[PDB]
Amino acid sequence: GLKIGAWVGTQPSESAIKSFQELQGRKLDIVHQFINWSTDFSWVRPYADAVYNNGSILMITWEPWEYNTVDIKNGKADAYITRMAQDMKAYGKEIWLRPLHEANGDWYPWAIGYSSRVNTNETYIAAFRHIVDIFRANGATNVKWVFNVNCDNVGNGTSYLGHYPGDNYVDYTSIDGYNWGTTQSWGSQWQSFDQVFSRAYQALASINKPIIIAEFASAEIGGNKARWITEAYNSIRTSYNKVIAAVWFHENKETDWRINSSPGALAAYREAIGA
Numbered sequence: 074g075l076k077i078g079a080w081v082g083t084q085p086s087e088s089a090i091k092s093f094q095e096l097q098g099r100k101l102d103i104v105h106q107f108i109n110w111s112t113d114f115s116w117v118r119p120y121a122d123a124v125y126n127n128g129s130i131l132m133i134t135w136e137p138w139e140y141n142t143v144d145i146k147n148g149k150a151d152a153y154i155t156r157m158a159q160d161m162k163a164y165g166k167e168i169w170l171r172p173l174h175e176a177n178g179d180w181y182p183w184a185i186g187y188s189s190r191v192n193t194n195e196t197y198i199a200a201f202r203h204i205v206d207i208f209r210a211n212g213a214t215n216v217k218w219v220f221n222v223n224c225d226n227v228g229n230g231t232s233y234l235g236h237y238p239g240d241n242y243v244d245y246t247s248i249d250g251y252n253w254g255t256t257q258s259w260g261s262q263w264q265s266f267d268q269v270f271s272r273a274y275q276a277l278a279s280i281n282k283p284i285i286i287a288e289f290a291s292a293e294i295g296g297n298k299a300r301w302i303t304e305a306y307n308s309i310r311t312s313y314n315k316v317i318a319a320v321w322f323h324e325n326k327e328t329d330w331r332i333n334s335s336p337g338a339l340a341a342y343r344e345a346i347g348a
């Protein structure tokens with residue numbers, strides 16, 4: 074039964090969660106939050122409490138703007154990692170944790186494609202494994218590890234599986250991707266869900282872990298977003314059998330990714346998610 078999640082456009086306060094649930098006409102199974110590597114668990118706790126009080130799973134994308142893969146694998150962030158592991162163990166509830174995401178792009182400073190050239194398959198895998206090792210040493214077995222790829226490899230040296238840290242360090246795999254429509258000056262084009270996600274899915278389907286669509290959305294311009302939404306959820310349920318969760322990215326950001334970017338898109342989203 075496909076789990077429905079979202080990043081709701083802001084940090085997931087009680088009110089932010091309830092407002093999105095009202096908006097989409099259905100409970101959120103998963104609530105998505107982003108934090109960095111200078112954020113303590115105490116800052117997360119109030120949000121985590123809201124999510125668990127609502128009866129949802131918290132998925133945290135944990136973004137090391139503050140440390141590259143060399144410094145992580147070498148142990149320079151270990152006090153901070155240990156602290157987080159300690160705090161998450163004490164909290165006790167099941168958290169899905171997605172460190173070092175979209176590493177097959179070139180936009181994040183921990184990514185293999187990043188133009189500093191600091192990050193390799195080897196440094197990435199060593200860093201990921203090191204994080205997981207520290208969590209396990211501190212008894213944080215409630216923390217489930219989410220590997221991730223961007224839908225497209227962007228930048229030098231990037232691939233779907235070169236940076237895969239291995240089944241022993243991973244609970245879920247995941248894919249991020251957007252239909253940018255005609256919104257970007259690099260000549261973005263309208264792409265169906267299948268055109269965005271099939272290649273990455275084909276790679277991840279070779280790993281015996283369940284798959285999350287951890288971020289997805291579509292622009293309005295360049296095509297019919299309402300139809301896109303209908304077809305995306307149909308595609309997931311028809312042809313992406315290993316996908317267990319679809320987590321929308323609801324933010325009015327580069328473009329209007331929101332499920333209510335138009336009344337038509339909202340109507341389509343409400344019917345698509347079902348249940």
Ligand SMILES: CO[C@@H]1O[C@H](CO)[C@@H](O[C@@H]2O[C@H](CO)[C@@H](S)[C@H](O)[C@H]2O)[C@H](O)[C@H]1O
Pocket residue numbers: 080084107108109136138288324
């Ligand atoms: C899709 O890529 C990303 O978008 C999210 C949501 O806008 C953004 O989240 C921010 O993450 C910050 C931690 O690094 C925290 S403090 C912000 O509150 C949150 O909005 C990601 O940074 C970005 O990569």
Ligand SMILES: OC[C@H]1O[C@@H](O[C@H]2[C@H](O)[C@@H](O)[C@H](O)O[C@@H]2CO)[C@H](O)[C@@H](O)[C@@H]1O
Pocket residue numbers: 175180223224225227249250251
């Ligand atoms: O996919 C999320 C990610 O997209 C980045 O743009 C990419 C895009 O992912 C890819 O599909 C396309 O072929 O190339 C562009 C090049 O940028 C975007 O830069 C990120 O901020 C965003 O997180």
